[PDB]
Design a binder for this molecule. Sequence first.
Ligand code: HEM
Length: 153
Amino acid sequence: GLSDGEWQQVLNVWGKVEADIAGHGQEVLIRLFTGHPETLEKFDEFKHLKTEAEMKASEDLKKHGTVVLTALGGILKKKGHHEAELKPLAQSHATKHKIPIKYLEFISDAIIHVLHSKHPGDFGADAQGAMTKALELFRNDIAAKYKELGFQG
Ligand code: HEM
């Protein structure tokens, strides 16, 4: 779905996330939860949080941010040859967690936001381009597996 040049850019950018996977992970989830409060309800571990401050002071949330970005990073490093790593992820988000693909769209957007926020001026037009496409590829492959399961919504 991407050229090596574009994969090259995705992994360059990923290097920025890797310098602080917890702070990036936390800011992604807070952006998600504050822009779409209904997503919070999918987590029994975090639905207690009400304010952004409480979210900001939650170490467990930072922990989960790490788990998420660790797993994404692992997929991205496969440069599209991620069937093995993605399948389990699509299966648990569809039948156990009951996560609509729109929420994956939401988090995808939330990653681009955060990158711009944390790195104003050094998250280029080409880098946005490649990152967006990889996130889309990720989303599409998930959508394929959702379809097979009839996870309709
Ligand atoms: C970048 C996209 C995502 C990645 C890489 C990711 C990754 C993970 C991983 C690795 C786990 C734990 C293992 C498992 O249960 O599969 C997990 C758990 C979970 N995810 Fe995601 N996830 C993503 C998006 C989302 C979104 C958008 C939602 C909801 C809005 C969500 C809701 C959950 C929930 C409810 C759990 C169970 C948490 C627990 O009780 O510990 N995920 N996710």
